[PDB]
From a paper:
In metazoa, the combination of Hsc70 (the constitutively expressed human cytosolic Hsp70), DNAJB1 (a class B JDP), and Apg2 (NEF Hsp110) can disassemble αSyn, tau and huntingtin exon 1 amyloid fibrils by depolymerisation and fragmentation. This reveals that DNAJB1 binds in a tightly packed array all along the fibrils with a 40 Å repeat. DNAJB1 interacts with the flexible C-terminus of αSyn, in particular residues 123–12919.
To see if the linker and J domain play a role in this binding geometry, we examined the complex formed by αSyn amyloid fibrils with a truncated DNAJB1, lacking the G/F linker and J domain (ΔJ-DNAJB1). As for WT DNAJB1, we performed single-particle analysis using the amyloid fibril reconstruction toolbox in RELION 3.1 to study ΔJ-DNAJB1 in complex with αSyn amyloid fibrils. This structure is different from the two forms shown in Supplementary Fig. 2, but similar to a reported structure with an additional density at the N-terminus displaying a hairpin-like shape (PDB: 6OSJ26). Despite this limitation, the maps clearly revealed DNAJB1 binding in an unanticipated, asymmetric position with one subunit of the homodimer closer to the fibril surface, packed with a ~ 40 Å repeat all along the fibrils.
Residue numbers in the entry:
A (entry chain C), B (entry chain B), C (entry chain A), D (entry chain D), E (entry chain E): 14 to 25, 36 to 97
F (entry chain J), G (entry chain I), H (entry chain G), I (entry chain F), J (entry chain H): 14 to 25, 36 to 96
Amino acid sequence: GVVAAAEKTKQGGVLYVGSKTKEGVVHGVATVAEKTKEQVTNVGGAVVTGVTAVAQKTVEGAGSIAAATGFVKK
Amino acid sequence: GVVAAAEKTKQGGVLYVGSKTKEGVVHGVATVAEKTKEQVTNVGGAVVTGVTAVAQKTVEGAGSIAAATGFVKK
Amino acid sequence: GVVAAAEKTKQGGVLYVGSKTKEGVVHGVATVAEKTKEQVTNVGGAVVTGVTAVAQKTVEGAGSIAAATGFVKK
Amino acid sequence: GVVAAAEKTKQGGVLYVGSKTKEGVVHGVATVAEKTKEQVTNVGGAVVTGVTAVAQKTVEGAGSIAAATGFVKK
Amino acid sequence: GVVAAAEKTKQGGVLYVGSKTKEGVVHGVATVAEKTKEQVTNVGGAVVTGVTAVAQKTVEGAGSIAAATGFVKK
Amino acid sequence: GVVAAAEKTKQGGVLYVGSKTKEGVVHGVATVAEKTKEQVTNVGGAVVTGVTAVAQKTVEGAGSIAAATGFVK
Amino acid sequence: GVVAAAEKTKQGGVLYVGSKTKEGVVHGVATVAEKTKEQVTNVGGAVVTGVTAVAQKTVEGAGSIAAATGFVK
Amino acid sequence: GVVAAAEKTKQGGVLYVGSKTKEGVVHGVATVAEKTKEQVTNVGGAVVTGVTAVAQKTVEGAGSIAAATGFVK
Amino acid sequence: GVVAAAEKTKQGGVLYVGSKTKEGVVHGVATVAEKTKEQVTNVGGAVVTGVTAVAQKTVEGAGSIAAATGFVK
Amino acid sequence: GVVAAAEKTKQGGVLYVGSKTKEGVVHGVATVAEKTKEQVTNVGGAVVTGVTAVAQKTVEGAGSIAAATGFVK
């Protein structure tokens, strides 16, 4: 049917951030709806959602997402 | 059949963040609805949703997500 | 048949975060609804949801999520 | 048949967080609803939900989640 | 029916967190509903939900969750 | 200094209130502060602070309030 | 000299309200502050602060308020 | 000399409201500040602060308010 | 100084309101500030701040307000 | 100084409102500011600030407001 496979087989500076905020409003991945049917949110990676957000060397391997929404098939 | 599979088999700087905020409002992954039917949220990775959020070497292997929603199939 | 499977078989630097907030409001993975049928939230990874959130070497292995919602099938 | 499986068979710096918060309000994985039928929350990983939340080397093995909700089949 | 299985067979820095809060309100994995039928919450990992939360080397093995809810099957 | 005087000398329908609440939260005359030096509240009248509040013919006479605060002299 | 004086000397229908609420939050006369010095609240009249608040023939006489705040000199 | 005086000397229909609320949030006379010095709220009349608020024949007399704030000199 | 005065002497119809709301947020006389010195709010009349607010024959006499703020001199 | 005065002496139709709201946000008299000195709000009349607001025969008498803000001298 719906298959997702991922494999990770292996034969194994300065980043300054200076901030100053006042009255910050932040939204990340958002899904606002009204009279819908499904609301699927699959996160395989990273979602950094700061007022001050820093990400370093974040996602290094084998992501796999398989989604199937609906399919009435009457 | 909804199948997910993940395998991780292995034969084995400075980051200053200076923050100063005042009245921050932060939302991460949000899902707002009225009169829906399913609300599926699968996180295979990382969701960092601070006012000051830092992620370092975060996700590094074998993420597998399989989602199948709805399917009336009458 | 909804199947997940994960295998992790293995044959085996300064992080300063200086913060100062005042009246911070933070929401992580949120799901708000009315008149729904299912609300599935599967976390195979990490959800860091601070005012000051730091994640380091967070997710390093064999994440498998298999979600199958709805399925009236008649 | 909803099956999960996981195996982890192994044949085997500085982290400074300085915080100062006044009146912080924090929510983690939240599921708010009215007139739902199921509310399933499976955590195979970590949910760190502080005002000052730090996670190091958090999830490193064989996470398996298999969820199957609804299924009227009538 | 609903089978889970997990096996873990093995044949073998500095953390400074300085916090200062005043009137911090913290929630974690929460599930709020009215007129619902099932409310299932399975934790196979860790939920750290302090005002100050630190989790080091948290989840290192063989997590397996298998959930099957609803199933009217008339 | 601070004088208040009040004299009252007297010589000689249908109310339907149908309410149906659920989880009501009510605050009346409120005063919230930090590091304040004085916090004075004088009520010469009526303070009706219900979830369902009905007031009829409440205050009919000689209210006198004399408030004098501070005076760091 | 802060003086308040009031005198009241007398030498002498259908009201239907129908309410149905759910999750009501109500604040009346509110005073929120930080690092203030005085917070004076004098009420000479009526403060009706319901979720369903009804006031009829409420205040009918001789209200006097005299407030004098601060005066560092 | 902050003076307030008031005198009231006297020598001798259908109202239907039908409401339906869900998740109502109401604030009346509100005063919000940070790092202020004085916060004076004198109410001589009526403050009706419902989700459903009805006021009939509310204030009919001799209201007198005298306010004097500050005056550093 | 600051003087007020008011005298009220006297020698003596269908109103249908049909309402239906959902998620109503209402504010009345509001005062929001940062680093102020005075915040004076005097009400000599009526402040009806409902979600469904009705006022009938509300204010009918002798309102007097005197206000004097500041005066650093 | 700052004086006020007011006197009210006297010697002795269907109105239908039908409303439907969903997600209504209403503000009345508002004063938003930062780093100011004074914030004065005197109400001598009526302030009706509903989602559905009706005011009938509201203010019929002798309003008087005197305000004097500042005057550094």
